[PDB]
Amino acid sequence: QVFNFNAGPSALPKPALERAQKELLNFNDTQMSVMELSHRSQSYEEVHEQAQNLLRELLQIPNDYQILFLQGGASLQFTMLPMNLLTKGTIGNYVLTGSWSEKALKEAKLLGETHIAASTKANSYQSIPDFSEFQLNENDAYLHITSNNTIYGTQYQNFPEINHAPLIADMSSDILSRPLKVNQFGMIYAGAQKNLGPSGVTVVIVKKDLLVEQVPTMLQYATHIKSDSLYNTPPTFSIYMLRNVLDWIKDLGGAEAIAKQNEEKAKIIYDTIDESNGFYVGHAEKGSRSLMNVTFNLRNEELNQQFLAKAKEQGFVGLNGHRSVGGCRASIYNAVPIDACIALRELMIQFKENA
Amino acid sequence: QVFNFNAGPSALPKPALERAQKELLNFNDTQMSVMELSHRSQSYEEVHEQAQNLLRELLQIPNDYQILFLQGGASLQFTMLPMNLLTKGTIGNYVLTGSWSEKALKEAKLLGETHIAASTKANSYQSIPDFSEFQLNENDAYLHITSNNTIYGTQYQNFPEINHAPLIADMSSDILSRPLKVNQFGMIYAGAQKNLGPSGVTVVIVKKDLLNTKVEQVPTMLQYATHIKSDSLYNTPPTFSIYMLRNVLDWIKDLGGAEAIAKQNEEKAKIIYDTIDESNGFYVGHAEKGSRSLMNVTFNLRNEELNQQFLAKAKEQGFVGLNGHRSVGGCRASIYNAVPIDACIALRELMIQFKENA
Ligand SMILES: *Cc1c(COP(=O)(O)O)cnc(C)c1O
Ligand SMILES: *Cc1c(COP(=O)(O)O)cnc(C)c1O
Ligand SMILES: [Cl-]
Ligand SMILES: [Cl-]
Ligand SMILES: [Cl-]
Ligand SMILES: [Cl-]
Ligand SMILES: [Mg+2]
Ligand SMILES: [Mg+2]
Ligand SMILES: [Mg+2]
Ligand SMILES: [Mg+2]
Ligand SMILES: [Mg+2]
Structure with a gap:
């Protein structure tokens, strides 16, 4: 008997893994593994698209949002977000509800002005702060939260109505564990390896019109939006596995x-x-x-x-x-x-x- | 009948895939997939270490080099290299031998001064330029080459002896296809998905003392020092891709x-x-x-x-x-x-x- 309570990477659905095993050598009658396919093949492109489609269906993601599949984990998103949105004269405003919040704030401080809208650090992150306590700025570039504070065991029950700047959430440890109103956010990101799939792909859901001269090509959201996450070679097996997990969530x-x-x-x-x-x-x-x-x-x-x-x-x-x-x-x-x-x-x- | 001439990702050696299939649900008697394990588990740590040790043995990597396993592809390396080494007052010097060379140069241009040491662009990249052609600068941060020009079908037969700056190579499409004298280089990088198995991991072989120092202003994830110090476990690695890399390397050794x-x-x-x-x-x-x-x-x-x-x-x-x-x-x-x-x-x-x- 084994009981898998790992915190990341984590348990995956048995049907998703059994499906992957059965067809590991011969995917969709191609006589190749999904791992041996070109990412510019119709075979792979179908899987890539189907992962996006299932996310869109399951989370009810509106058409004015795009679904990106990136490498680098949530930790790369800690820098990529301010690199794209924390522009001169603006503030990256953070709600601190655990250590992952702190790590995100730290990367923004390297790139521009930051601020702490609210924090339960003083009480060892035992709770989510009351939204009425948030200190907001007219020149906020965004308000960043951590929906589920993986180390501290706390979670947002609901999300604030933010109208002055986009709301951005690190949802690594609770994405697609419950319905979401995606229109509350400008951006959601999550490494796959807790609720969606194996490690090696990061899901980024971004309001298209939100998102940069001088930023490296691979670190612009725009690069990945315009190329449908096919600008360079994606983590093809990880996205295949994501698709399999999403099929399992849909089936239940x-x-x-x-x-x-x-x-x-x-x-x-x-x-x-x-x-x-x-x-x-x-x-x-x-x-x-x-x-x-x-x-x-x-x-x-x-x-x-x-x-x-x-x-x-x-x-x-x-x-x-x-x-x-x-x-x-x-x-x-x-x-x-x-x-x-x-x-x-x-x-x-x-x-x-x-x- | 299927004949797999895919250019990237590409054919894997069947025994690496058969091995992965057999143990996909129960890896190392844990009753979990390698994909379900902590990267801090003994079972995963063994894989991570064995992948490094197999690369070290197979390519005869000296002990003053470290092997990194990074996400982002070779394309992320096109920016991470100049972000870490293209300092004020120095030049990122490039040998252009195909499109992938051009893409690497383009990213350096966003970050500092660049130069073209030599190029066969005018003749549509039919050849590797003679090393006597290379235009070197005393303030070169590095000289970057592309060992195998995947789109054009040309390849370096051997590598220049460079003493004024580190030699850096994008070896994505020919790494571990032949013996290599790693000590000619300061850094070698390769997306794994051409000759080493999985997409989703990039192998970076680095002379430790060239790149193990903090670089002011560079985001944590984009510093080589972060990954050197943490043995490529700073954040969650692409565990299944590194596992598959291990399996491919075992096959190369076996043959x-x-x-x-x-x-x-x-x-x-x-x-x-x-x-x-x-x-x-x-x-x-x-x-x-x-x-x-x-x-x-x-x-x-x-x-x-x-x-x-x-x-x-x-x-x-x-x-x-x-x-x-x-x-x-x-x-x-x-x-x-x-x-x-x-x-x-x-x-x-x-x-x-x-x-x-x-
Ligand atoms: C898992 C986790 C991370 C770290 O993700 P990586 O993919 O390892 O970078 C970031 N944020 C939260 C909330 C997490 O739970
Ligand atoms: C495949 C290839 C790349 C691009 O690699 P990605 O992992 O897709 O970024 C870069 N350089 C060469 C020589 C290649 O063959
Ligand atoms: Cl936390
Ligand atoms: Cl955690
Ligand atoms: Cl090329
Ligand atoms: Cl190519
Ligand atoms: Mg707590
Ligand atoms: Mg009761
Ligand atoms: Mg179904
Ligand atoms: Mg045969
Ligand atoms: Mg052997």
């Missing part, structure tokens, strides 16, 4: 259906914490609790380590919290099945009963 | 390494160039003979109607990828390491029959 009923599964998964772990009479304590304020990364600790470090060691012995993978914060983190992205969360509960109850 | 693959590549290139040369001008190769690539064989028939008819027949007969690059037309047989010799035999037979029946 789409974003509302996966949201219901993810809410049940999270409920199992949070009820276990809440009913534990303080033996397990979550990091996040209840009102900010993530459905994607559940962070918690036991009453002392010795017990934390004992629990994590027992989990590892019993086949659980990935539960150690991020190094920077310690404790435990159960990552329960889309393809983590409910039975793994049940198994984690049962382990948690047995461990407490035998403590 | 006898760089020396053995060179022998194989020379043989299968000769099959196609002999067909051209014995065709009494029915097929005309683009490259001058002294510069002919072992990796991309470029040619035309006597007019565009015949080119179209040949390519249409090829496709009907199961050949994939023979259309020349859009920018130049004609035909291009890409014959990277993993293209089997019997595909080259089949192409010869197609070419002879088409000639005879024309």
Whole structure:
């Protein structure tokens, strides 16, 4: 028995992997792997387009947005965004809700004026700040948020109505885990390796008209928009796998259906914490609790380590919290099945009963 | 019948793919795919390290060089190289031997002073210029070359001895197709998808002391130092692509390494160039003979109607990828390491029959 709670890269749907295995040597009767196709072939172009189409359908992405498939991870987006939009006399305004927010802010500071609209850093990122607290500037280039704060286990329940500058979100750890109103954003980005696919491709959803002389060709959004993410060779297998994952989400009923599964998964772990009479304590304020990364600790470090060691012995993978914060983190992205969360509960109850 | 002459991504050695298929769901007894593992797991770390160690052994990479695995393609390297080394007061000096050379130069121009050391552009890139032609500057930041000019079908036979600045090479389409004296270079880069397997990873072989220092003003992800210090694990790497690279490198080693693959590549290139040369001008190769690539064989028939008819027949007969690059037309047989010799035999037979029946 293995239970895959890895935080990134992460569990993928079994049907998507089984499909990939079956046709790894002979894709679509071509007698070649999808990995052996030219990216300028109709065979590959169909897959590329179908990944975009499924994202568009599943997230209900309006026609005035384009869907980009880029290399470099979300971390490259931390610099590519200000490189394109943080122009002279404008401000890259950030809401800090965890360490990933901080890493994005850091890259903008190298390129122009920045600002902190709001922050829960002083309280160790236990919550999402009230939107009424945001400090906005007329010359903001954008307002950047982190929808799901992967290390801290907090998540935006809803998104602010921002009209003075585009809203930009790092959705790496919760994209397509629930329906979204894409019209609230100027740009959304996410490495694929938590909810959408394997590592090596980054999805960027951008309002077309939003997006640069002096910027290197590969680092302009415009390059990729105009070329439909085929300016240079894309990560063809990663985009194929993304397509397979998106087919799986569609087959189960789409974003509302996966949201219901993810809410049940999270409920199992949070009820276990809440009913534990303080033996397990979550990091996040209840009102900010993530459905994607559940962070918690036991009453002392010795017990934390004992629990994590027992989990590892019993086949659980990935539960150690991020190094920077310690404790435990159960990552329960889309393809983590409910039975793994049940198994984690049962382990948690047995461990407490035998403590 | 399928014959895969795709130019990028391209044929993989079947055992690398069969290995990946077999263990796609349960890698190293973990009951997870390599695609589902942490990059900090022992199972992945072993793959990441073995890929480096296989490249090191196969190319005889000295210990003062590091192997980086980066995202972004060779195209991102066209900007990352000048961003890190083209400093104020210095020149990015380029040898133009094809379109990919031009694309690299274009990115440097956005960032600093550039120069053209030598060029065969005026003659449509039929050859590699003689090294005696190279115009060097005392303030060169580097001299950049393209070892195999993938669109034009020409290739360096050997490499210049440069002492005034580091020699940098885009080796995307011929890396590890033959032995290489890595110590001639300050940096070598290659998208993996021509001769080393997967798209989505770029191999960068760097002389550590040339590039391990922070570069003021350059974004974290775009500094070589970031990736050198973190062993290409600064952010999440393209784990499946690096895994597949490992599998391809295991295959190259198994077949006898760089020396053995060179022998194989020379043989299968000769099959196609002999067909051209014995065709009494029915097929005309683009490259001058002294510069002919072992990796991309470029040619035309006597007019565009015949080119179209040949390519249409090829496709009907199961050949994939023979259309020349859009920018130049004609035909291009890409014959990277993993293209089997019997595909080259089949192409010869197609070419002879088409000639005879024309
Ligand atoms: C996973 C993660 C990242 C880092 O992504 P890379 O692809 O490794 O650069 C960035 N932001 C958030 C919120 C993450 O969860
Ligand atoms: C394939 C190729 C490139 C482009 O590589 P990408 O990974 O698509 O950016 C650059 N240089 C040469 C010589 C090539 O053959
Ligand atoms: Cl975080
Ligand atoms: Cl994280
Ligand atoms: Cl070229
Ligand atoms: Cl090419
Ligand atoms: Mg918290
Ligand atoms: Mg379906
Ligand atoms: Mg209850
Ligand atoms: Mg071996
Ligand atoms: Mg055969």
